């Protein structure tokens, strides 16, 4: 009945740097006769469950290392990590539990920073097998490139093509974060007989000019 | 009852226009009455202790 | 501190009946109020009801109020959560929590099961050809590409596990017809191309259907 | 056939808990639907609930639905009747019947134990004189008159059950302040008048008064 | 949801006289599959459990003498007694057993009758100790009368009474169907400080002159 809010949503800050996330309240959440924040804040890793990691918005559970604080008062509450790790990047939850039922926060994803890459590009054409069944899809690899802001641009005969195209990210490379996009289009045996140069064009804050990769039809 | 007061009196109850004073009559009770208790009964009445601790917490901890 | 054991994993077909089971080991358990919460895939959490074993007080949430039934058992200290007629719309990893109190924050969480609803399909996998004009000082990629398989999840393994570095996979995507696609491709440098074998070998199992492809570079 | 034993008469303030119980005793009692009737004082039955030993389904009437609980304990034969706050009003005598189907008559049926809610107020025993002047050949009246008495009833009997003939007991009519009155009136010939001695022997009970009235001819 | 309906209320027959009752249902409530009546009859003596009489409205209970009968179909349903005895005198009752919930009937009393009879009267006056409590009480007392048509008025200086009297009668005697009348007036004090003379008139059917019994206050 008392909704929770987050921010930032995604924050992205290097090794060693302070993190300060923010939760807000509809309503006060304090117990009169004990005079204590009643709100928690939750850790979860990816495939595992959920970690508490500070209760009365105040006091820190056994074995929870120094580094992570929490602070504040009426409504507004903010958990601040003094100096981020390589073991912190997770997801981070503001729980209020004063009248049943317990709402949730939204949660927020930590994760590291890193300088500026540049995308090795890749194309693949469809096997013999794909044109068989009906259905032909091309596929162009974006590699290694840090950051996300970014995008891909099919060519077809100097004709833009839309509404036909998926995109999957993978999560960032543990070792060094690094991305890698793939952008795939699917058309039928009809819009392959289309024409005769397929590219894939790609656009990346870090890379200076566009690049381009096109195979022809033979 | 307001929270946490004992209220320890034996009056007699007028639930009707009638003042009898004291004479537990038609339409004046006892408030107080006992508590069946027998060994060979349901568990729903049966004798159950209660004990409830109350923390607080103000100065001088 | 007492664990919570969750009982397994169950995939079922629409309009059946689930039962699922959180079991409650350790000292102390006199006064733990069972939670249950539900996780959808990749999204937050989202509290659904909690039960105190023995007395039995239930309280809901207003989404959920009716939909299931929570109950407990005292005697084993088990906590039971109930579907009458699962939908298609249930599939997800669901955690059994125990806190010490009414307004209490939850510490100690079961591992947690899965749910999973629908009609198996199976992979119909397809392997690219590297391009042939390539950096021959550099690397080209390669891979096999997984298709109309349905539902999650696929397994694609290089070279029966030999083979891991630089082979990216990549989450399924849904597209119109519901069966996921996705595809893992490996970055190889043009020298040993000539020499080394590629073989994607897929696996689901809720269609029982394990496949070694080899991948082959092609020329005119 | 196997017969219904009732639990027995309890008198209650307002403001408590009451459990009734039936009683099953007997071969073949594998199907017998129990069904609770409750009687006003004079006035025609009410069927009240239907429950199956067992299985526990339980059909009420609309007007009594959720007012009391009907429920049954297998292992003994025996169906509850609980009252969770009775009021003033529930003075009445309940039965209980046992068919041997739905849509079934009821046959089988139990003593039936009554119920009284209220306050105990005794009562004030004054005697009528006979009037002097009557038929000296005849007949005259005497009896004594029971008055503010609650609840009924109250029990008058004759020179310690001596004298049985021509004893008129009238029920007793509830005037404006409640508590109803009664006059008992023997008709005796004008011989016996000066011989033969009347004593009225009013029983309370609830209020545990037992007054012995003599009845006087008053004269000049 | 299916409300009956009885007739006659009281019905008055002498000794073995045939008896009709009368039930009405307001649907009919015949089994389609094996064409029976659903309905029963019930016979209550006073003072004990009602038993049954009639099921499936045609058929006896084992036990049952042959007196009685029953007959109807439709909604209209009755209930015959060829003659009558001196045990029927009781109330009857009408239920179906169609559908859930059971309704029953009102309920019919079936006693006997006499020849028409005289009541001989009675009057007492309070005594002593009604007087000192506050609230005199006067009372007249017709006896071995039948039948109840009848009404007793008070008389006070040749003025009416109304709405200060009780009337008690009593149920029929067994061994002689003879009834017996209490009317009782309370007046307070200052009601009996009122006047001279206080008397009991009686009109009965029978009686073919109204009958007076006067006492003097004195």
């Known amino acids: 009945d008392i909704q929770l809010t987050q921010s930032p949503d995604s924050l992205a800050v290097s090794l060693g740097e302070r993190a300060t996330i923010n939760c807000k309240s509809s309503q006060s959440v304090l117990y009169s006769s004990i005079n204590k924040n009643y709100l928690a804040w939750y850790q979860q890793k990816p495939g595992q469950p959920p970690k508490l990691?500070?209760?009365?918005?105040?006091?820190?559970?056994s074995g929870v290392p120094d580094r992570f604080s929490g602070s504040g008062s009426g409504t507004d509450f903010t958990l601040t990590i003094s100096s981020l790790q390589a073991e912190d990047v997770a997801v981070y939850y503001c729980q209020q539990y004063y009248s049943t039922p317990y709402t949730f926060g939204q949660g927020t994803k930590v994760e590291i920073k890193r300088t500026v890459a540049a995308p090795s590009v890749f194309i693949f054409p469809p096997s013999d097998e794909q044109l068989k069944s009906g259905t032909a899809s091309v596929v162009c690899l974006l590699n290694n490139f840090y950051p996300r802001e970014a995008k891909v641009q099919w060519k077809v005969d100097n004709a833009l093509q839309s509404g036909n195209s998926q995109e999957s990210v993978t999560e960032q490379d543990s070792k060094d974060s690094t991305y890698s996009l793939s952008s795939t289009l699917t058309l039928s045996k009809a819009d392959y007989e289309k024409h005769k140069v397929y590219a894939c064009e790609v656009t990346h804050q870090g890379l200076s000019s566009p690049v381009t990769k096109s195979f022809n039809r033979g | 009852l307001k929270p946490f007061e004992r209220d320890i009196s034996t009056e007699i109850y007028q639930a009707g226009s009638t003042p009898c004073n004291g004479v537990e009559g038609f339409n004046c009770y006892f408030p107080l009455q006992s508590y069946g208790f027998q060994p060979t009964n349901g568990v729903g009445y049966q004798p159950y202790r209660v004990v409830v601790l109350s923390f607080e917490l103000l100065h001088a901890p | 501190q007492m664990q919570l054991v969750q009982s397994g994993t169950e995939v079922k077909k629409p309009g059946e009946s689930l039962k699922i089971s959180c079991?409650?080991?350790?000292?102390?358990?006199?006064?733990?109020?069972?939670?249950?919460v539900r996780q959808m895939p990749g999204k937050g959490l989202e509290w659904?009801?909690?039960?105190?074993?023995?007395?039995?007080?239930?309280?809901?949430?207003p989404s959920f109020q009716g939909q299931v039934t929570i109950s407990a058992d005292k005697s084993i200290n088990t906590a039971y959560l109930q579907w009458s007629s699962l939908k298609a719309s249930d599939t997800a990893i669901y955690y059994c929590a125990g806190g010490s109190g009414i307004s209490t924050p939850m510490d100690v969480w079961g591992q947690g099961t899965t749910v999973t609803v629908a009609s198996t399909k199976g992979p119909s996998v397809f392997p690219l050809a590297p391009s042939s004009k390539s950096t021959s000082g550099g690397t080209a990629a390669l891979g096999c590409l997984v298709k109309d398989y349905f539902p999650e999840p696929v397994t694609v393994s290089w070279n029966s596990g030999a083979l891991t570095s630089g082979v990216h996979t990549f989450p399924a995507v849904l597209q119109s017809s519901g069966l996921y696609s996705l595809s893992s491709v490996v970055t190889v440098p043009s020298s040993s191309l000539g020499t080394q074998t590629y073989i994607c070998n897929v696996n689901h199992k809720p269609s029982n259907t394990k496949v070694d492809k080899k991948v082959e570079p092609k020329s005119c | 056939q196997m017969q219904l034993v009732q639990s027995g008469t309890e008198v209650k303030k307002p403001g408590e808990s009451l459990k009734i119980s039936c009683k099953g005793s007997?071969?073949?009692?594998?199907?017998?639907?129990i069904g609770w009737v409750r009687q006003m004082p004079g006035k025609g039955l009410e069927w009240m609930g239907i429950?199956?030993?067992?299985?526990?389904?339980?059909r009420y009437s609309p007007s009594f639905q959720g007012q009391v609980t009907i429920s049954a304990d297998k292992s003994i034969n025996t169906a509850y009747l609980q009252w969770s706050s009775l009021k003033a009003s529930d003075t009445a005598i309940y039965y209980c019947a046992g068919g041997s189907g739905i849509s079934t008559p009821m046959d089988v049926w139990g003593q039936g134990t009554t119920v009284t809610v209220a306050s105990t107020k005794g009562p004030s025993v004054f005697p009528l004189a006979p009037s002097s002047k009557s038929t000296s050949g005849g007949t005259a009246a005497l009896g004594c008159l029971v008055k503010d008495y609650f609840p009924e009833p109250v029990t008058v009997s004759w020179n310690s059950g001596a004298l049985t003939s021509g004893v008129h007991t009238f029920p007793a009519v509830l005037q404006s302040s409640g508590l109803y009155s009664l006059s008992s009136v023997v008709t005796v010939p004008s011989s016996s008048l000066g011989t033969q001695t009347y004593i009225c022997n009013v029983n309370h009970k609830p209020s545990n008064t037992k007054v012995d009235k003599k009845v006087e001819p008053k004269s000049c | 949801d299916i409300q009956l309906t009885q007739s006659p209320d009281s019905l008055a027959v002498s000794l073995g006289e045939r008896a009709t009752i009368n039930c009405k249902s307001s649907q009919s409530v015949l089994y389609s599959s094996i064409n029976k009546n659903y309905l029963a009859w019930y016979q209550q003596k006073p003072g004990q459990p009602p038993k049954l009489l009639i099921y499936?409205?045609?058929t006896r209970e084992s036990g049952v003498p042959d007196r009685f009968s029953g007959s109807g179909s439709g909604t209209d349903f009755t209930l015959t007694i060829s003659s009558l005895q001196a045990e029927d005198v009781a109330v009857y009752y009408c239920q179906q057993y169609y559908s859930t919930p059971y309704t029953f009937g009102q309920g019919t009393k079936v006693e006997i009758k006499r020849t028409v009879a005289a009541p001989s009267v009675f009057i007492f006056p309070p005594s002593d100790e009604q007087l000192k409590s506050g609230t005199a009480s006067v009372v007249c007392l017709l006896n071995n009368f039948y039948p109840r048509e009848a009404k007793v008025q008070w008389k006070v200086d040749n003025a009416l009474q109304s709405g200060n009297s009780q009337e008690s009668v009593t149920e029929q005697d067994s061994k002689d169907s003879t009834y017996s009348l209490s009317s009782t007036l309370t007046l307070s004090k200052a009601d009996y400080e009122k006047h001279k003379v206080y008397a009991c008139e009686v009109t009965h059917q029978g009686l073919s002159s109204p009958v007076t019994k006067s006492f003097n206050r004195g």
């Open positions: 007997g071969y073949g009692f594998i199907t017998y639907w």
């Open positions: 429950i199956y030993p067992g299985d526990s389904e339980t």
């Open positions: 499936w409205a045609s």
